[PDB]
Amino acid sequence: KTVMQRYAHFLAHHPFLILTLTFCANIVLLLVIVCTDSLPAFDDPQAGFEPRGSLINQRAQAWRNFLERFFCSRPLLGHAKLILRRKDAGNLLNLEGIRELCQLDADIRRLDEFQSCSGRLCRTWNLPNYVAVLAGKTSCHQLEEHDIRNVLNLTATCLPFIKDSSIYHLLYFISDKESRETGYSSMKHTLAVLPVWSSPAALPLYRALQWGNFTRPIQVIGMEMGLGDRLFNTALLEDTLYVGVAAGVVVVVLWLYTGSLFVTLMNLMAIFFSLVVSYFLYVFVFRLTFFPFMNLLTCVIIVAIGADALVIFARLWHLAKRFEKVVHATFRHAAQAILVSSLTASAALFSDIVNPIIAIRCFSIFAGLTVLVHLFFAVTWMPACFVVADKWGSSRQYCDYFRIFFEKLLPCLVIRLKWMWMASFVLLTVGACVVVFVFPGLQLASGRTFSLWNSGHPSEQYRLLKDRFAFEENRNLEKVSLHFVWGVLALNQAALLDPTDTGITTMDGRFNMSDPLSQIWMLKFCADLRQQTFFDNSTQSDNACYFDSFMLWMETGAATFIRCVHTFSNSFPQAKHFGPNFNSLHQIDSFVLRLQTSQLFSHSYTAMQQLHQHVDQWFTAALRTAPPSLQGAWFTGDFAFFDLQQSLISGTALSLIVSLFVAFLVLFFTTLNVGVSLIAITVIAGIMLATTAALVLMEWQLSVFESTIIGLAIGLSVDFTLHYAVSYCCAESYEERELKTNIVISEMASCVTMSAVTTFLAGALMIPSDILFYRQLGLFIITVTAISLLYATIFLPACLAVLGP
């Protein structure tokens, strides 16, 4: 408005002063934050997300309660490196059988070990161990291998797959399977050698990565413990740094391509960093706000938002081609789009904050702060453009393509001419999207406790494939893991979406085991829990309470509940009082617990969560039946993973609803005349769901990362649609028909093209830079981009649908 125009004139008058007032702020923020704390440093690679679903609290509580109270025959602790049935390892095994190349590679690794990660021992052996008894020789003839294979097969009696005297060799085989009957060949070689013994330090790990690159007979996979976590940290460091740098480069390239701005555009990128600085600053005061993925989404979001802003500025410059006053008016029009984008981002933050996840919450905060930062950036960017106008050059690229804009215009025209046809195509795509959500199915599960895939690093990727080949070689060192207990210490988690330990010592509502009431209550618990857990199988059937009453009735003694509890605690004859129990030791008190095995533990939570839910209901009914109904947290280790998945699903849904709120807020910010962009926003959301489904087409499993990506994507898509939205809004009054839609699409097409290029660049740079560390994020970004472009072409058909029939 007038005052807004006045601020614009204030900026125009301060084409340099205004810019300084922001660039300096960025610098100061960078310094203060750097000095105050080392925010860029990340404590851990793991997300550690807290589900917060009435069960996550119980789990955290159980955790807290428990916490309250010949030569070189290296063991498993020594970092093992096994390569089996691989093209690289295959060459090694074939040459080992012929020229003994594998043995030489192992020796070379030992030589590298002497330098670092080396009393020091030469090397553990799997294949060299067999012939080692006869003699240690790098020659490695075939006759020795044949004899070794014969003894390996002779060891079928002890383990089906002399021979007993080679006990150490037998252990070697245990470590290296599928090399006896199959033989020492390219087929499942399973190196399994220990170059370093008991070495989880980071420096040996770094050397291990290079060693894994066959820099020191080709070895495919190697492993390291403890050192693996350090490697993952290094992965987050180097890989994310590279992808981010590439992102900045692409953004700069795009800026020059669109606006041919060599300093102001660069200043926009620097402004993105400034924004990150502001976010970091404000967040630090309110909380730690640290998460690796938070940084990843931060860089991605910044790239996209800044891209949008630059797109806005460029659109204004194109419309420009008093002049400063009209420039200001264009600044206002674009400011609307900037505001729309910011709205999308902020609501995205709201989505990630609704579901409290140690990871999702941080991403949300970074997004929100960076978003408001992007708004101030929308201002500064405008100032940057103003300065560009104030000065061209030091004191030159024509940047013009023949009929390119016209070519896009014609593309918009063709899309518009077949308004009915394109509309049908989009609707069909929407139907296909919903179908995908149905079939194969929206819900997905992770294949393990930590994550379905938890190795983004290449060397770590080899280590993961090694983990699988190890599962083949060595048995995974699953069974049921339920454990009902006495109570809950703190149902409320660490205050406000904060990853922390709310309490250290347990707590429970003061309840006493009334001799007649409690014993029978525990007995009933044992009976029903027997019907659910025992399942006619032998596994921790005895209950710390019923067994106690039994031992007491057998001992016949020496207010029965208190005395009996005291006697049992004093005695604890069987299984040391069932291992952990009576955690209420601060004062003489009796606590209860029970490790059960009702159902098998499954990595996937499709049914594992079904079982946890069934058990949850059974426990709920049991608690209902109990007369004192004293709260007891019946948590299970598996219940935690199931909850993580449940929370991920809850977050996705809450995010979608939040997206509904985003669309509503957008139209509320962009719809005062007759009609509303809600129809369009809904179409966009459908496109977002379509993108999610497309990710499924990419087989991206449903995981925390997948969730965060779905959120950021909802944002990117909303911004894409925002342009067309504001346009249709403005054009309806002017022509109210396919003609208005044509012109609106004409102006929109430019924005669409720019945003498309921006997203494509960010996604491409990020996905290739990291081999699965953040590749899922880049792929998701690309998916969002594709769905966005599709939705872009369909955006205008939406307007057509808005036109009266």
Coordinates of C-alpha atoms in Angstrom, one line a residue, residues 338-763:
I338 CA 7.5 -13.9 -1.5
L339 CA 4.9 -13.8 1.3
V340 CA 3.1 -16.8 -0.2
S341 CA 6.4 -18.7 -0.2
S342 CA 7.1 -17.8 3.3
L343 CA 3.7 -18.9 4.3
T344 CA 4.3 -22.3 2.8
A345 CA 7.6 -22.6 4.6
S346 CA 6.2 -21.5 7.9
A347 CA 3.3 -23.9 7.8
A348 CA 5.8 -26.6 6.8
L349 CA 7.6 -25.7 10.0
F350 CA 4.3 -26.0 11.8
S351 CA 3.8 -29.5 10.4
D352 CA 7.3 -30.6 11.5
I353 CA 6.6 -29.1 15.0
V354 CA 3.2 -30.6 15.5
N355 CA 4.7 -34.1 15.6
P356 CA 7.4 -33.9 18.2
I357 CA 10.4 -35.8 16.7
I358 CA 13.9 -34.9 17.8
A359 CA 14.6 -34.6 14.1
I360 CA 11.4 -33.3 12.6
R361 CA 11.2 -30.6 15.3
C362 CA 14.6 -29.2 14.5
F363 CA 13.9 -29.1 10.8
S364 CA 10.8 -27.2 11.5
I365 CA 12.5 -24.6 13.6
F366 CA 15.3 -24.1 11.1
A367 CA 12.7 -23.8 8.4
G368 CA 10.6 -21.2 10.2
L369 CA 13.5 -19.0 11.2
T370 CA 15.0 -19.3 7.7
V371 CA 11.6 -18.5 6.3
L372 CA 11.2 -15.2 8.1
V373 CA 14.8 -14.7 7.2
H374 CA 13.8 -15.2 3.6
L375 CA 11.2 -12.5 4.0
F376 CA 13.7 -10.0 5.3
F377 CA 15.7 -11.4 2.4
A378 CA 12.8 -10.6 0.1
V379 CA 13.4 -7.1 1.2
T380 CA 17.2 -7.1 0.9
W381 CA 16.9 -8.8 -2.5
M382 CA 14.7 -6.0 -3.6
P383 CA 17.5 -3.7 -2.2
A384 CA 20.0 -5.8 -4.1
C385 CA 18.1 -5.3 -7.3
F386 CA 17.9 -1.6 -6.5
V387 CA 21.6 -1.4 -6.2
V388 CA 22.0 -3.3 -9.5
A389 CA 19.9 -0.6 -11.0
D390 CA 22.0 2.1 -9.4
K391 CA 25.1 0.7 -10.9
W392 CA 26.0 -1.5 -13.9
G393 CA 29.5 -2.9 -14.2
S394 CA 32.6 -1.8 -12.3
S395 CA 32.2 1.8 -13.2
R396 CA 29.1 -7.7 -20.4
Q397 CA 26.7 -10.5 -21.3
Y398 CA 23.7 -9.7 -23.5
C399 CA 22.1 -12.7 -21.9
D400 CA 19.5 -13.2 -24.6
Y401 CA 18.2 -16.3 -26.4
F402 CA 16.2 -16.0 -29.6
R403 CA 12.5 -17.0 -29.3
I404 CA 13.1 -18.7 -26.0
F405 CA 10.6 -16.7 -24.1
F406 CA 8.4 -16.9 -27.1
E407 CA 8.9 -20.7 -27.2
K408 CA 7.8 -20.9 -23.6
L409 CA 4.9 -18.6 -24.5
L410 CA 3.9 -20.9 -27.3
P411 CA 4.2 -23.9 -24.9
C412 CA 1.8 -22.1 -22.6
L413 CA -0.4 -21.5 -25.5
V414 CA -0.5 -25.2 -26.5
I415 CA -1.2 -26.2 -23.0
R416 CA -3.9 -23.7 -22.8
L417 CA -5.5 -24.6 -26.1
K418 CA -6.2 -28.1 -24.9
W419 CA -7.6 -27.0 -21.6
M420 CA -10.1 -29.8 -21.4
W421 CA -7.5 -32.4 -22.4
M422 CA -4.8 -31.3 -20.0
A423 CA -7.4 -31.1 -17.2
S424 CA -8.4 -34.7 -17.8
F425 CA -4.8 -35.7 -17.8
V426 CA -4.1 -34.0 -14.4
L427 CA -7.3 -35.4 -12.8
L428 CA -6.2 -38.9 -14.0
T429 CA -2.8 -38.4 -12.5
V430 CA -4.5 -37.4 -9.3
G431 CA -6.6 -40.6 -9.4
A432 CA -3.4 -42.6 -10.0
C433 CA -1.7 -40.9 -7.0
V434 CA -4.5 -41.8 -4.6
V435 CA -4.5 -45.3 -6.0
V436 CA -0.7 -45.5 -5.4
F437 CA -1.4 -44.4 -1.8
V438 CA -3.9 -47.3 -1.7
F439 CA -2.0 -49.8 -3.8
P440 CA 0.7 -50.8 -3.1
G441 CA 0.1 -48.7 0.0
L442 CA 0.9 -45.5 1.9
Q443 CA 2.4 -47.2 4.9
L444 CA 5.9 -48.7 4.7
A445 CA 8.2 -50.0 7.4
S446 CA 11.9 -50.0 8.2
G447 CA 13.9 -53.2 8.0
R448 CA 15.9 -52.9 11.3
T449 CA 16.1 -51.2 14.6
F450 CA 18.3 -48.2 13.8
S451 CA 17.1 -47.8 10.3
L452 CA 16.3 -49.8 7.2
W453 CA 19.5 -48.3 5.7
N454 CA 21.8 -46.5 8.1
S455 CA 25.0 -46.0 6.0
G456 CA 25.1 -43.0 3.8
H457 CA 28.9 -43.1 3.3
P458 CA 30.4 -45.1 0.4
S459 CA 32.9 -46.9 2.6
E460 CA 30.0 -47.2 5.1
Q461 CA 27.9 -48.4 2.2
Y462 CA 30.4 -51.2 1.6
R463 CA 30.3 -51.8 5.4
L464 CA 26.5 -52.2 5.2
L465 CA 26.7 -54.6 2.3
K466 CA 29.3 -56.2 4.4
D467 CA 26.9 -56.3 7.3
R468 CA 24.5 -58.3 5.0
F469 CA 27.3 -60.6 3.8
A470 CA 28.3 -61.0 7.4
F471 CA 24.7 -62.0 8.3
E472 CA 25.4 -64.7 5.7
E473 CA 28.8 -65.4 7.1
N474 CA 28.2 -64.9 10.9
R475 CA 24.8 -65.2 12.6
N476 CA 23.4 -61.9 13.7
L477 CA 24.6 -61.5 17.2
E478 CA 15.3 -62.3 16.6
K479 CA 13.3 -63.1 19.7
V480 CA 10.4 -61.4 21.5
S481 CA 11.2 -58.6 23.9
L482 CA 8.2 -57.5 26.0
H483 CA 8.5 -56.1 29.5
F484 CA 5.6 -54.9 31.6
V485 CA 6.6 -52.8 34.7
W486 CA 5.6 -51.0 37.9
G487 CA 5.1 -47.5 36.6
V488 CA 6.0 -44.3 34.8
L489 CA 8.4 -41.6 36.1
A490 CA 7.5 -38.7 33.8
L491 CA 4.7 -38.9 31.2
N492 CA 5.6 -35.4 30.1
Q493 CA 8.9 -35.6 28.1
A494 CA 11.7 -33.1 28.3
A495 CA 9.8 -29.8 28.1
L496 CA 8.7 -28.5 24.7
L497 CA 9.9 -30.5 21.7
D498 CA 13.3 -30.8 23.3
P499 CA 15.6 -33.8 23.2
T500 CA 16.6 -34.4 26.8
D501 CA 16.3 -36.6 29.9
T502 CA 13.3 -35.3 31.8
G503 CA 14.3 -37.4 34.8
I504 CA 17.1 -39.7 36.0
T505 CA 15.5 -41.6 38.9
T506 CA 12.1 -43.3 38.4
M507 CA 8.9 -42.2 39.9
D508 CA 5.5 -43.7 40.5
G509 CA 2.2 -42.7 42.1
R510 CA 2.3 -43.8 45.7
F511 CA 0.6 -47.1 45.7
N512 CA 0.9 -50.0 48.1
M513 CA 0.6 -53.7 47.6
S514 CA -2.4 -54.3 50.0
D515 CA -1.8 -57.9 51.1
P516 CA -5.2 -59.2 49.9
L517 CA -5.7 -56.8 47.0
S518 CA -2.2 -56.6 45.3
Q519 CA -1.3 -60.3 45.4
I520 CA -4.5 -61.2 43.7
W521 CA -4.1 -58.4 41.2
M522 CA -0.6 -59.6 40.3
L523 CA -1.9 -63.1 40.0
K524 CA -4.7 -62.0 37.6
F525 CA -2.0 -60.1 35.7
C526 CA 0.0 -63.3 35.6
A527 CA -3.0 -65.3 34.3
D528 CA -4.0 -63.0 31.5
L529 CA -0.3 -62.3 30.7
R530 CA 0.2 -66.0 30.6
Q531 CA -2.6 -66.4 28.1
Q532 CA -0.9 -63.7 26.0
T533 CA 2.8 -64.2 26.6
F534 CA 3.3 -67.8 27.6
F535 CA 1.6 -69.1 24.4
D536 CA 2.7 -72.7 25.4
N537 CA 6.4 -71.9 25.0
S538 CA 9.3 -71.9 27.4
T539 CA 10.7 -68.4 27.8
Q540 CA 10.7 -66.4 31.1
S541 CA 7.3 -67.9 32.0
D542 CA 7.7 -67.2 35.7
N543 CA 6.5 -63.9 37.1
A544 CA 8.5 -62.0 39.6
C545 CA 5.4 -61.8 41.8
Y546 CA 3.8 -65.3 41.4
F547 CA 7.1 -67.0 41.7
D548 CA 7.7 -64.9 44.8
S549 CA 4.5 -66.0 46.3
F550 CA 5.3 -69.5 45.4
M551 CA 8.8 -69.4 47.0
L552 CA 7.1 -67.9 50.1
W553 CA 4.4 -70.5 50.3
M554 CA 7.1 -73.1 50.0
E555 CA 9.3 -71.4 52.6
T556 CA 6.1 -70.9 54.7
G557 CA 7.2 -67.5 56.0
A558 CA 9.8 -66.7 58.6
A559 CA 0.4 -57.3 56.3
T560 CA 1.7 -60.2 54.3
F561 CA 2.6 -58.3 51.1
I562 CA 5.2 -55.9 52.7
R563 CA 6.8 -58.6 54.7
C564 CA 6.8 -61.0 51.8
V565 CA 8.4 -58.4 49.6
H566 CA 11.1 -57.7 52.1
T567 CA 11.8 -61.4 52.5
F568 CA 12.0 -61.9 48.8
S569 CA 14.4 -59.0 48.3
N570 CA 16.5 -60.3 51.1
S571 CA 16.5 -63.8 49.7
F572 CA 16.4 -63.4 45.9
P573 CA 17.3 -67.1 45.5
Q574 CA 16.2 -67.7 41.9
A575 CA 17.6 -65.6 39.0
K576 CA 18.8 -63.0 41.4
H577 CA 15.2 -61.9 42.1
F578 CA 14.4 -62.1 38.3
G579 CA 17.3 -59.8 37.5
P580 CA 16.0 -56.2 37.6
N581 CA 13.1 -55.8 40.1
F582 CA 12.1 -53.8 43.2
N583 CA 13.6 -50.6 41.7
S584 CA 11.9 -48.7 44.5
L585 CA 15.0 -49.0 46.7
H586 CA 15.5 -45.4 47.7
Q587 CA 13.1 -46.2 50.5
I588 CA 12.0 -49.6 51.5
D589 CA 9.5 -50.2 48.7
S590 CA 8.4 -52.9 46.3
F591 CA 8.5 -52.4 42.5
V592 CA 7.4 -54.9 39.8
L593 CA 8.5 -55.8 36.3
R594 CA 8.1 -58.7 33.9
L595 CA 10.0 -59.6 30.8
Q596 CA 7.6 -61.4 28.5
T597 CA 7.7 -63.0 25.1
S598 CA 4.1 -62.9 23.8
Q599 CA 4.9 -62.5 20.1
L600 CA 7.9 -62.7 17.8
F601 CA 9.8 -59.5 17.2
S602 CA 9.6 -58.3 13.6
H603 CA 11.7 -55.5 12.0
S604 CA 8.7 -54.4 10.0
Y605 CA 6.0 -52.8 12.1
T606 CA 3.1 -53.5 9.8
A607 CA 2.1 -56.3 12.1
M608 CA 4.7 -55.8 14.8
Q609 CA 2.8 -52.6 15.6
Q610 CA -0.3 -54.6 15.2
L611 CA 1.0 -56.9 17.9
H612 CA 2.1 -53.9 20.1
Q613 CA -1.4 -52.5 19.6
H614 CA -3.1 -55.7 20.5
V615 CA -1.0 -56.0 23.6
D616 CA -1.6 -52.3 24.3
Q617 CA -5.3 -53.0 24.3
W618 CA -4.9 -56.1 26.4
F619 CA -2.9 -54.2 28.9
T620 CA -5.4 -51.4 28.8
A621 CA -8.2 -53.8 29.6
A622 CA -6.1 -55.4 32.3
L623 CA -5.5 -52.0 33.9
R624 CA -9.2 -51.2 33.7
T625 CA -10.0 -54.5 35.5
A626 CA -7.5 -53.8 38.3
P627 CA -9.0 -52.2 41.5
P628 CA -6.2 -49.7 42.4
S629 CA -5.5 -49.4 38.7
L630 CA -2.0 -48.1 39.7
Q631 CA -0.3 -46.8 36.6
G632 CA 2.4 -49.2 35.3
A633 CA 4.3 -48.6 32.2
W634 CA 4.2 -51.8 30.2
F635 CA 6.8 -50.9 27.6
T636 CA 8.8 -53.1 25.2
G637 CA 12.0 -52.5 23.4
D638 CA 10.3 -53.4 20.1
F639 CA 7.4 -51.2 21.1
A640 CA 9.8 -48.3 20.7
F641 CA 10.6 -49.0 17.1
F642 CA 6.9 -49.6 16.4
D643 CA 6.3 -46.3 18.1
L644 CA 8.9 -44.6 15.9
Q645 CA 7.1 -45.8 12.9
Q646 CA 3.8 -44.9 14.3
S647 CA 5.1 -41.4 15.1
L648 CA 6.5 -41.1 11.6
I649 CA 3.0 -41.9 10.2
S650 CA 1.5 -39.5 12.7
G651 CA 3.9 -36.8 11.5
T652 CA 3.1 -37.5 7.9
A653 CA -0.6 -37.2 8.5
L654 CA -0.3 -34.1 10.8
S655 CA 1.9 -32.6 8.1
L656 CA -0.7 -33.2 5.5
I657 CA -3.4 -31.6 7.6
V658 CA -0.9 -28.8 8.3
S659 CA -0.6 -28.5 4.5
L660 CA -4.4 -28.1 4.5
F661 CA -3.9 -25.3 7.0
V662 CA -1.2 -23.9 4.7
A663 CA -3.5 -23.9 1.8
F664 CA -6.2 -22.3 3.8
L665 CA -3.8 -19.6 5.1
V666 CA -2.6 -19.0 1.5
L667 CA -6.1 -18.4 0.2
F668 CA -6.9 -16.4 3.3
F669 CA -3.9 -14.3 2.4
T670 CA -4.8 -14.4 -1.3
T671 CA -8.6 -14.6 -1.6
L672 CA -11.0 -11.8 -0.8
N673 CA -13.0 -11.6 -4.0
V674 CA -15.6 -14.1 -5.2
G675 CA -14.3 -17.6 -5.2
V676 CA -11.2 -19.0 -3.5
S677 CA -7.9 -20.6 -4.5
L678 CA -8.9 -23.5 -2.3
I679 CA -9.8 -25.5 -5.4
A680 CA -6.3 -24.8 -6.8
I681 CA -4.6 -25.4 -3.5
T682 CA -6.4 -28.7 -3.2
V683 CA -5.2 -29.6 -6.7
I684 CA -1.7 -28.7 -5.6
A685 CA -1.9 -30.9 -2.5
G686 CA -3.1 -33.7 -4.6
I687 CA 0.0 -33.2 -6.7
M688 CA 2.0 -33.3 -3.5
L689 CA 0.5 -36.6 -2.6
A690 CA 1.3 -37.7 -6.1
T691 CA 4.9 -36.8 -5.6
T692 CA 4.9 -38.9 -2.4
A693 CA 3.5 -41.8 -4.3
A694 CA 6.2 -41.2 -7.0
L695 CA 8.8 -41.5 -4.2
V696 CA 7.2 -44.9 -3.6
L697 CA 7.6 -45.6 -7.2
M698 CA 11.3 -44.9 -6.4
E699 CA 10.8 -47.4 -3.5
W700 CA 11.8 -44.7 -0.9
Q701 CA 10.7 -46.4 2.2
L702 CA 8.6 -44.6 4.9
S703 CA 11.2 -43.3 7.3
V704 CA 12.0 -40.2 9.3
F705 CA 14.0 -38.9 6.4
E706 CA 11.2 -39.8 4.1
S707 CA 8.8 -37.8 6.3
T708 CA 11.0 -34.7 6.5
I709 CA 11.3 -34.8 2.7
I710 CA 7.5 -35.1 2.3
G711 CA 7.2 -32.0 4.4
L712 CA 9.8 -29.9 2.5
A713 CA 8.2 -31.1 -0.7
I714 CA 4.7 -30.0 0.3
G715 CA 6.4 -26.6 0.7
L716 CA 8.1 -26.6 -2.7
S717 CA 4.9 -27.6 -4.4
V718 CA 2.9 -25.0 -2.6
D719 CA 5.3 -22.3 -3.8
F720 CA 5.2 -23.6 -7.3
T721 CA 1.4 -23.3 -7.2
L722 CA 1.5 -20.0 -5.5
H723 CA 2.5 -18.1 -8.7
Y724 CA -0.4 -19.5 -10.7
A725 CA -2.6 -18.9 -7.8
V726 CA -1.9 -15.2 -7.4
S727 CA -2.0 -14.9 -11.1
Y728 CA -5.4 -16.5 -11.7
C729 CA -6.6 -14.2 -8.8
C730 CA -5.4 -11.1 -10.6
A731 CA -6.5 -12.1 -14.1
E732 CA -10.1 -13.2 -13.2
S733 CA -11.3 -9.7 -12.9
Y734 CA -9.6 -8.6 -16.1
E735 CA -11.0 -11.3 -18.4
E736 CA -12.7 -14.1 -16.4
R737 CA -12.1 -16.7 -19.2
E738 CA -9.5 -18.9 -21.0
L739 CA -8.2 -15.6 -22.3
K740 CA -7.4 -14.4 -18.8
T741 CA -6.1 -17.9 -18.0
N742 CA -3.9 -17.6 -21.1
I743 CA -2.4 -14.3 -20.0
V744 CA -2.1 -15.4 -16.4
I745 CA -0.4 -18.6 -17.6
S746 CA 1.8 -16.4 -19.7
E747 CA 3.1 -14.5 -16.8
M748 CA 3.1 -17.6 -14.7
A749 CA 5.1 -19.6 -17.2
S750 CA 8.1 -17.5 -16.5
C751 CA 8.0 -18.1 -12.8
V752 CA 7.4 -21.8 -13.4
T753 CA 10.4 -22.1 -15.7
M754 CA 12.6 -20.4 -13.2
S755 CA 11.5 -22.3 -10.2
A756 CA 11.7 -25.5 -12.2
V757 CA 15.3 -24.8 -13.2
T758 CA 16.2 -23.9 -9.6
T759 CA 14.7 -27.1 -8.1
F760 CA 16.2 -29.3 -10.8
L761 CA 19.6 -27.8 -10.1
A762 CA 19.4 -28.1 -6.4
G763 CA 18.2 -31.7 -6.5

